[PDB]
């Protein structure tokens, strides 16, 4: 919007950027009761008229000027006995368009969510296409690899002006100072034009028609301090007067939204399995290798020389992804856990088209609930009408803060909620010694109703199984048959154990609290849920550990499950636990492999899920089409 004031005293000169509203003030300097307007053919005057200020006179230019002032407007002021007094206006039209991929396919200054929304996407440039380097690509002020440009978002400035136009005008590209630390912009002929402590740049643009390409990288994920929006603006300046400051004639802009870090549920098809089972195990590792092949997965394995005896590949990292219309790449969220695997995500996982993030304090100030077996996501889910098409992040907490309670660090929680497309849900896991949601829940795919089952550990179910076995004559059957060094225990004495039953009633109650919580927060019905027979015991601080290998802590590789071998009571040549589980899951077309993790994992307080990790295929559904 511009108001040009015209004057019989003086001719007026003015620029008109196409796609802009220009109007005339014809009254303020008028000499005379009426006026007429006459303009050249490229000006459309939209509006023999009375000289009253309520008269809207609006000018539109059809196309760019070939020369300065090549369009013109004559305002004739005339009266009842006065010969006409004319006022002149000389116009110069220009095209100035800052473009970006605002329809989210392939190239209102407002970013809107949803299929009918608008606004271009920006990726955080958190991988490392630069060969033999340690740092992420967005850490320097240079484009060092041509393929790095694939991660960046294209923005273009198209101008169409007279050959002499930038004699007297200048263009400046800018970003707010509040945002300059979160973005870098490169000018393609690459050299940096905008970024940290570089909030504006004068552009060198020749007259006529020109097109200038820019490449934009984000430097920061959305977070509590950063909603995720970056605005870049082009300003046109009149630099005509040597005795005067520059004068803004026109501003236009593009708003980008930085892509959120997104997790993938056990229902997304697996692409790559990780273990760092180079340590004293080997048949464990053989078993996961067979599963990986059955599942058609790359297999990556971490040597004891790198592990540092840290076998818990689930816990230091979570492989998610970022996604823009032009580019999608996996991104490792590196837990601050910082144990033997500390170097693995930064040295072995991050790299070409493999992004990196971390959060939280890196030198301690951490808890077990920051290990990423405490970080999971549900399958897609619709809940009393609200749709969650990438699922809902699930993570474990206490039921209230006490001096004795634990939580995942606030920095991590805040980062996850600021990603806003998998709206996290706090679960209750602090009752477990280790403290992770992967100790009592899993999701697996299913061919029917909602496409998954929620699996939950279930003391109830194991008591039922064992009772049924004893009812049919097998109370002498031994739990822990098969084991080198273990006290065998008979079904009958397990059932008769009143303290064990007390402990497992308490655990049942903790698990049921989450059952109902997941029901509410995911819109699950009982028919979405399968109980896995599982016994627990309480130990130090009355905290819960698995009584026999925790079977819900499984590896889900499509229809192929890697389940800790419970070494349960052998009845008809078969562990009845294995039997029960198979009867529960095989009707969904899942294939159960029971992996001996006993001396290697189980007795160190984790199982098969805990010892492994999976990279899975990103959702087809584009995050930006959500309405969070």
């Amino acid at each position: 919007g511009t108001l040009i004031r015209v004057t019989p005293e003086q001719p007026t000169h003015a620029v008109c950027v196409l796609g802009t509203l220009t109007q005339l003030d014809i009254c303020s300097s008028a000499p005379c009761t009426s006026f007429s307007i006459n303009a050249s053919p490229g000006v459309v005057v939209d509006i023999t008229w009375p000289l009253d200020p309520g008269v809207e006179v609006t000018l539109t230019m059809k196309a760019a000027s070939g020369s300065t002032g090549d369009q013109k407007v004559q305002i004739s002021y005339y009266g009842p006995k006065t010969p006409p007094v004319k006022a002149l206006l000389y116009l110069t039209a220009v095209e100035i368009s800052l473009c970006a991929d605002i329809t989210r396919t392939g190239k209102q200054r407002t970013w809107t969510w949803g299929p009918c929304g608008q606004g271009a996407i920006l990726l955080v440039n958190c991988d490392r296409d630069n060969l033999e380097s340690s740092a992420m690509d967005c850490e320097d002020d240079e484009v060092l690899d041509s393929e790095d440009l694939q991660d960046m978002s294209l923005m273009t400035l198209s101008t169409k002006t007279p050959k002499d136009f930038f004699t007297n005008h200048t263009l400046v590209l800018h970003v707010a100072r509040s945002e300059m630390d979160k973005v870098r912009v490169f000018q393609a002929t690459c050299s940096v034009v905008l970024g940290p402590k570089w909030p504006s740049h004068y552009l060198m643009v020749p007259g006529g028609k020109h097109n200038m390409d820019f490449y934009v990288e984000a430097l920061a994920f959305p977070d509590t301090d950063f909603p995720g929006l970056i605005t870049l603006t082009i300003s046109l300046l009149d630099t005509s007067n040597l005795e005067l400051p520059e004068a803004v004639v026109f501003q236009d802009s593009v708003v980008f939204r930085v892509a959120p870090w997104i997790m993938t549920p056990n229902t997304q098809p697996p692409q790559e399995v990780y273990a760092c089972s180079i340590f004293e195990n080997e048949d464990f590792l053989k078993s996961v290798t067979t599963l990986a092949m059955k599942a058609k997965c790359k297999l990556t394995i971490c040597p004891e020389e790198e592990n540092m005896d840290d076998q818990w590949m689930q816990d230091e990292m979570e492989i998610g992804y970022i996604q823009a219309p032009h580019k999608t790449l996996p991104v490792v969220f590196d837990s601050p856990r910082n144990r033997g695997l500390k170097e693995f995500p930064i040295k072995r996982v991050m790299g070409p088209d493999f992004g990196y993030v971390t959060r939280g304090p890196q030198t301690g100030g951490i808890s077990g609930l920051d290990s990423f077996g405490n970080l999971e996501v549900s399958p897609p889910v619709t809940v009393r009408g609200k749709e969650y098409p990438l699922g809902r992040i699930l993570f474990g907490d206490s039921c209230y803060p006490s001096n004795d309670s634990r939580q995942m660090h606030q920095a991590l929680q805040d980062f996850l909620s600021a990603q806003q497309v998998q709206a996290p849900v706090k679960l209750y896991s602090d009752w477990l010694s280790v403290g992770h949601v992967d100790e009592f829940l899993s999701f697996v795919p299913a061919p029917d109703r909602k496409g998954f089952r929620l699996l939950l550990a279930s003391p109830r179910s194991c008591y039922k199984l064992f009772q049924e076995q004893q009812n049919e004559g097998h109370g002498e059957a031994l739990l822990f048959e098969g084991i080198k060094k273990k006290k065998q225990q008979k079904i009958k004495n397990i059932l008769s154990n009143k303290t064990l039953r007390e402990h497992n009633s308490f655990v049942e109650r903790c698990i049921d609290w989450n059952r109902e919580l997941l029901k509410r927060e995911l819109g699950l019905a009982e028919s979405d849920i399968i109980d896995i027979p599982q016994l627990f015991k309480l130990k130090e601080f009355s905290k819960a550990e698995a009584f026999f290998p925790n079977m819900v802590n499984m590896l889900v590789l499509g229809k192929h499950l890697g389940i800790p071998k419970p070494f349960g009571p052998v009845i008809n040549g078969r562990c009845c636990l294995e039997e029960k589980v198979c009867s529960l899951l095989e009707p969904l077309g899942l294939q159960c492999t029971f992996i001996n993790d006993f001396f290697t994992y189980h007795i160190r307080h984790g199982e098969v899920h805990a010892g492994t990790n999976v990279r899975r295929k990103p959702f087809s559904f584009k995050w930006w089409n959500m309405v969070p």
Binding site: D309, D310, W312, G368, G373, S433, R604, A610
Partner: peptide
């Protein structure tokens, strides 16, 4: 290594 600690 103990998972928890």
């Amino acid at each position: 290594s103990g998972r928890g600690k």
